[PDB]
Structure 1
Amino acid sequence: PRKGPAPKRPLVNDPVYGSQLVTQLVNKVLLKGKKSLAERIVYGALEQARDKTGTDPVITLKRALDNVKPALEVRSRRVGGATYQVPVEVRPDRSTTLALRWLVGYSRQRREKTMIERLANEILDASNGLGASVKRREDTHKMAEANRAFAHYRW
């Protein structure tokens, strides 16, 4: 707002996995207040995954998130008679949240029966670099690289 940034909300360690990204991805998945439901979904995704991964599931999900992490986005601005976009660097806490928000949004429209294994194959194909959010990464990246010419308007 006007008076500086607002304080962020801490998120405690997951009981199943000594990691925070699970606790935060489940909260992203959360809708209407079904923490229990979203949590069993995330856990079921990882526990379905370990069979086809062999690697530890949070290690696999980190591999996916390192792929789908944005670096430089295309934030808009209008100066004269024509609006255009500005390539701007994305700080990591925004970048990871945006990446896994894309994951949730495109796992809500992927083609299987239900979202448990939908998200499961999303995680594995993002750790292997083939997915829909994966291709969004390098299309948003190239859209911003094609507007790097306007990076000299950094507000």
Structure 2
Amino acid sequence: MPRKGPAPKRPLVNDPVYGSQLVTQLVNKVLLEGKKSLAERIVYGALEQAREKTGTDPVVTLKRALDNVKPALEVRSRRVGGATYQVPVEVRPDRSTTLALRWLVNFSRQRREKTMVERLANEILDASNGLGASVKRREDTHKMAEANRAFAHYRW
């Protein structure tokens, strides 16, 4: 319900196995639309696989990855005077978290491992360390939002 104010959102519970909101949001984003229990198993096995390959708590590793992927400035698609002038806008924490997790899932399904369990585990690792597609996209979006500061004072 836009044009009327902030839109109410569905609340999110923590993971039963793990107990973290980021874990459950990652589950729902890796969730191929139609199945959850199998998607939950896949994200699970991915998180344990990240666990032994990191030796730490998968929730903390996912938090580190999300921080290494969370954006700070977003670019909309406003048309100003018939010319595409990019207006960067500060991102709210929920929107930035959603963007980071969406990027993580999108580049997780891109990987070429045997299973998307392995693909998601490798994506988690490559976002935590800072050598994955999600991290480089986080760098590129900030680079492009800083390259167009001349249009940043529009304040929309």
TM-score tier by shorter-chain length is over 0.9
Matched-pair contact (CA < 8 Å) for 2:104–2:134 = yes
Matched-pair contact (CA < 8 Å) for 2:27–2:43 = yes
The alpha-carbon deviation at position 2 of structure 1 amounts to 2.0
After superposing on structure 2, the runs of 4+ consecutive aligned residues of structure 1 that deviate more than 3 Å are none
Matched-pair contact (CA < 8 Å) for 1:68–1:134 = yes
Q: Deviations over 1:21-65 (max 9, x none)?
A: 111111111122211011001110111222111111111111111
In structure 1, the residue matched to 2:33 is: 32
Under a length normalisation based on structure 2, what TM-score does the superposition of the two structures give?
0.94
- Which runs of 5 or more residues in structure 2 are unaligned? none
Greater fraction strand: 1
Q: Describe the SS at the equivalent of 1:88.
A: strand
Under a length normalisation based on structure 1, what TM-score does the superposition of the two structures give?
0.94
CA RMSD of aligned residues (A): 1.2
Matched-pair contact (CA < 8 Å) for 1:46–1:57 = yes
Q: Describe the SS at the equivalent of 1:84.
A: coil
Matched-pair contact (CA < 8 Å) for 1:49–1:124 = yes
Q: Percent identical across equivalent pairs?
A: 96
- Which runs of 5 or more residues in structure 1 are unaligned? none
Matched-pair contact (CA < 8 Å) for 2:108–2:122 = no
Q: Describe the SS at the equivalent of 1:10.
A: coil
Aligned pairs, number: 155
State the distance in 2 between where 1:18 and 1:32 align.
22
The alpha-carbon deviation at position 111 of structure 1 amounts to 2.2
